Design a protein around this nucleic acid. Structure first.
Lengths: 125, 125
RNA sequence: UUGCUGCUGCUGCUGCUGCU
RNA sequence: UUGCUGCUGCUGCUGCUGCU
C-alpha cells in the first residue's frame, strides 16, 4: 500500500464499455471517454484514467484530481538527501504533455503541470 | 543539410562564457543564460539554446523562434502515409516540458507547445 | 481510442562518469 | 547550470504484436 497523489479514484473503462462507446461514437479519438494522467516519483508511478466531457462542471471536477499539497504528501515518502526525478504526464486526444525535473523543483513542476492540464483539457477540438 | 523549424540561430554559450557567467552570478540555476528547446520529427532532432533575460522584450523575441508554419514546413519533409512521432521539448530553470504525439496531431502539438513555452518562460521564480 | 504483454526506434527526467 | 562521451534507472511518443 502507498499513499497516492490523487484525490479521485481511477475510472478506467472496461473493455466492454470501451467497445460500446466505440460503436455509438463517430470518431473516438475526437470524443474519448476521458483522459489519462500519471505522477512518477523515482521509479514509483501512480496513474488515473478520468472521465471528462468538456463541460465546465467536468473540467472543474477533474482539475480537483490532485493538488500541490496532495502531490507533495505523496512524493515526500520517497525523498532523501539525493534528488529523485519527478514527472507528471497527461494524454488527451492524441497529445501528451509531460512536465519533469528533480524533486527540488516539485513546487514548480506542480504549477506547470496544473496549467498544462488545464490548457490541454480546454484545447479547441 | 535539412530545413530547420527554427527561425532564430542557435546561441549556445561556449564553455568559457558559461564559466564566466557562473563566476559573476549567485545561483545559476535561478539565472541561466537562457533556455533550451528542441523539435523532433521521427528520428531527426533540431535544437536551440536561446538567450532569455525574463523581460517582455526578450520573451517576445524567443517566442518568435518557431511558428506553426515553420514547424509544419520542416516536419512535412519527413511525412508519408504512416504517422511518425513528433515532440517539442523545452527546459528552463530545472523544469522540462515535452509535448508529443503523432504527426496527424501536429497542429495541436504546436498550439500546446507554444502555450507551454510561454507559461514556462513566465513562471514566477 | 479501455487495460495489459512482447518487440522496435526516438525523446525527456534523475543519478553517476570523463572531457569541453 | 554551455556543449558533448560512456554508464544507470524511470518516463513519454511513434510503429509493430498478442490478449482484454
Amino acid at each position: 500500500h502507498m499513499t497516492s497523489p490523487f484525490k479521485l479514484p481511477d475510472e478506467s473503462p472496461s473493455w466492454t464499455e470501451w467497445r460500446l462507446h466505440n460503436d455509438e461514437t463517430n470518431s473516438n479519438q475526437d470524443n474519448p471517454l476521458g483522459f489519462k494522467e500519471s505522477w512518477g516519483f523515482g521509479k514509483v508511478v501512480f496513474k488515473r484514467y478520468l472521465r471528462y466531457d468538456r463541460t465546465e462542471a467536468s473540467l472543474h471536477r477533474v482539475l480537483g484530481s490532485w493538488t500541490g499539497d496532495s502531490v507533495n504528501y505523496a512524493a515526500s515518502r520517497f525523498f532523501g538527501f539525493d534528488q529523485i526525478g519527478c514527472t507528471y504526464s497527461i494524454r488527451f486526444r492524441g497529445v501528451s504533455i509531460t512536465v519533469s525535473g528533480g524533486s527540488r523543483t516539485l513546487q514548480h513542476l506542480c504549477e506547470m503541470a496544473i496549467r498544462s492540464k488545464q490548457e490541454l483539457l480546454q484545447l479547441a477540438p
